[PDB]
Write a protein that binds this ligand. Structure first.
Ligand SMILES: Nc1ncnc2c1ncn2[C@@H]1O[C@H](COP(=O)(O)OP(=O)(O)O)[C@@H](O)[C@H]1O
Ligand SMILES: [Cl-]
Ligand SMILES: [Mg+2]
Ligand SMILES: [Mg+2]
Length: 330
């Protein structure tokens, strides 16, 4: 199967015992997607909504901040994307209530003839990618190890929960992580954008995929060698995200001695042995039946974190908060 095939996705959504159209918080309208703009009111079903400003632009969608006094977000996309609403609904259903804070809730979905509007939870302090870019514009240039390791551990923990729900995110990268006000109180880190996600419960047991991402660079290890894959795509995504935090550029992998490893000479990289082991396990998965333990991966990082950064993490996050606030004020 091609898990991103529009026909397959249509067939899957069509044959659900509980289709998206049946949800109490789904709203189907027989009209075009209304014009949405910053600083403008517009009718959304029974409720009138005021659109504040554009928060971010993804590969497909626009995400606006909005209010009815609680503020929320509107993810707008052409054509409609009921699939992301499905996945988001399943994820929050399958997740333990204590895990849901690490992800974005969808309050409702408004589906139109030519597009859709998903209403969901707001995270106020920008993407992880933006945080990385904020460090570029400082003398220290790169995020400090205390934060990088802390975020990395949270990422491993996050996808362990998602995979426990038998879901694949399918697009794990820096701009799909958001920081919220909880960070001011890796607590406020959240993983969003389930548009390309895969629900493995909709396929037979042990199903695998061969389909490849469009770009040669964003392809995981299995894709680059036409090998089959399922959950390994999220492992590669986490590894690539961590690599961006470390080096401020996207990860490109090479093959040496049958082993896959990131390029770059890894100069000026502290905890070298920790990261080599981290990238080794994440990028060298024997097969779909031998996925490395996400818990164990996190424990090894946690060992180094506890050894060096428990007393310093406080100042490190305060430093970042100042940069985030400076960014938000502008
Ligand atoms: N919950 C959120 N709070 C604030 N901004 C968000 C939120 N979700 C997404 N965004 C912003 O919108 C952008 C695109 O949304 P995303 O879900 O990635 O859609 P796409 O599938 O088009 O990438 C993100 O990169 C981010 O900047
Ligand atoms: Cl953790
Ligand atoms: Mg995105
Ligand atoms: Mg997306």
């Amino acid at each position: 199967p091609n898990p991103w095939d529009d026909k397959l996705i249509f067939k899957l959504l069509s044959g659900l015992s509980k289709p998206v159209s049946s949800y109490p918080n789904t709203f189907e309208w027989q009209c075009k997607l209304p014009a949405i703009k910053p600083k403008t009111e517009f009718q959304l079903g029974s409720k009138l909504v005021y659109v504040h400003h554009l928060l971010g632009e993804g590969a497909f969608a626009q995400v606006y901040e909005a209010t009815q006094k609680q503020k929320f977000v509107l993810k707008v996309q052409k054509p409609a994307n009921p699939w992301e609403f499905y996945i988001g609904t399943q994820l929050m259903e399958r997740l333990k209530p204590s895990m849901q804070h690490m992800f974005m809730k969808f309050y409702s979905a408004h589906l139109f003839q030519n597009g859709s509007v998903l209403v969901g939870e707001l995270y106020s302090y920008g993407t992880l990618l933006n945080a990385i870019n904020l460090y570029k514009n400082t003398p220290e240039k790169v995020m400090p190890q205390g934060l990088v390791i802390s975020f990395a551990m949270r990422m491993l923990y996050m996808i362990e929960q998602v995979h426990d729900c038998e879901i694949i995110h399918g697009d794990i990268k820096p701009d799909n992580f958001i920081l919220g006000n909880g960070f001011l109180e890796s607590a406020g880190l959240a993983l969003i954008d389930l548009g390309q996600s895969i629900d493995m419960k909709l396929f037979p047991k042990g199903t695998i995929f061969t389909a490849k991402c469009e770009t040669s660079g964003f392809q995981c290890v299995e894709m680059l060698s036409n090998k089959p894959w399922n959950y390994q795509i999220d492992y590669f995504g986490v590894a690539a995200t961590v690599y961006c935090m470390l080096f401020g550029t996207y990860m490109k992998v090479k093959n040496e001695g049958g082993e896959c490893k990131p390029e770059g000479l890894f100069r000026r990289l502290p905890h070298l042995d920790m990261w080599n082991e981290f990238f080794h396990v994440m990028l060298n998965i024997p097969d779909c039946h031998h996925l490395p333990s996400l818990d164990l991966l996190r424990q090894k990082l946690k060992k180094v974190f506890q050894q060096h950064y428990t007393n310093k993490i406080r100042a490190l996050r305060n430093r970042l908060i100042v940069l985030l606030l400076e960014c938000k004020r502008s």
